[PDB]
């Protein structure tokens, strides 16, 4: 198995489908994202196609088997409400946590600005993943708050079943 397998360090990779593009995060050696963005289908990343490891239409979340030589993000362990969201345009929007899976937007931005960011991971100022963006809440083209799935939900999804035939 002598393979160079040279790659650049990057916990978050760019993932896209045949309808839209979004970002995913690898937690515990497992990629994570929302179902409406990726869904239970093949994902084309920078390396190529990706195999499906976990799927949950009810929870709107899917995961892929992380290839070897990949990094992972630890869970948040600081009780910090403030969170940082990674946008596909290399933009970080400070989001204050207002619940287990609910947050608020300090700067009112158009929904288009947040589009293409679902699946991205949110990291607390300490430097640990806190969850993944799922959808934004807006009234008339302006989003004032956002919703994300905490990393704790991932533990129950994998524990409930391992998608084994």
């Amino acid at each position: 198995t002598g393979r160079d397998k040279n790659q650049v360090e990057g916990e978050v990779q760019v993932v896209s489908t045949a309808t839209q593009s979004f970002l995913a995060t690898c937690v515990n050696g497992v990629c994570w994202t929302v179902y409406h963005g990726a869904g239970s289908k093949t994902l084309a990343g920078p390396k190529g196609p990706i195999t499906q490891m976990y799927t949950n239409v009810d929870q709107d979340l899917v995961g892929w088997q992380a290839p070897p030589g990949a990094r992972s993000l630890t869970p948040c362990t600081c009780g910090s409400s403030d969170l940082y969201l990674v946008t596909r345009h290399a933009d970080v929007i400070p989001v204050r946590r207002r619940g287990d899976s609910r947050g608020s937007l300090l700067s009112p931005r158009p929904v288009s600005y947040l589009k293409g960011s679902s699946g991205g991971p949110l990291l607390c100022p300490s430097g640990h993943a806190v969850g993944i963006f799922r959808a934004a809440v807006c009234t008339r083209g302006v989003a004032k708050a956002v919703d994300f799935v905490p990393v704790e939900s991932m533990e129950t999804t994998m524990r409930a079943s391992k998608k084994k035939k």
């Binding site: 409406h36 963005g37 947040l114 293409g116 679902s118």
Partner: peptide, 4 residues
Amino acid sequence: ELXX
């Protein structure tokens, strides 16, 4: 709103 879903974004994805």
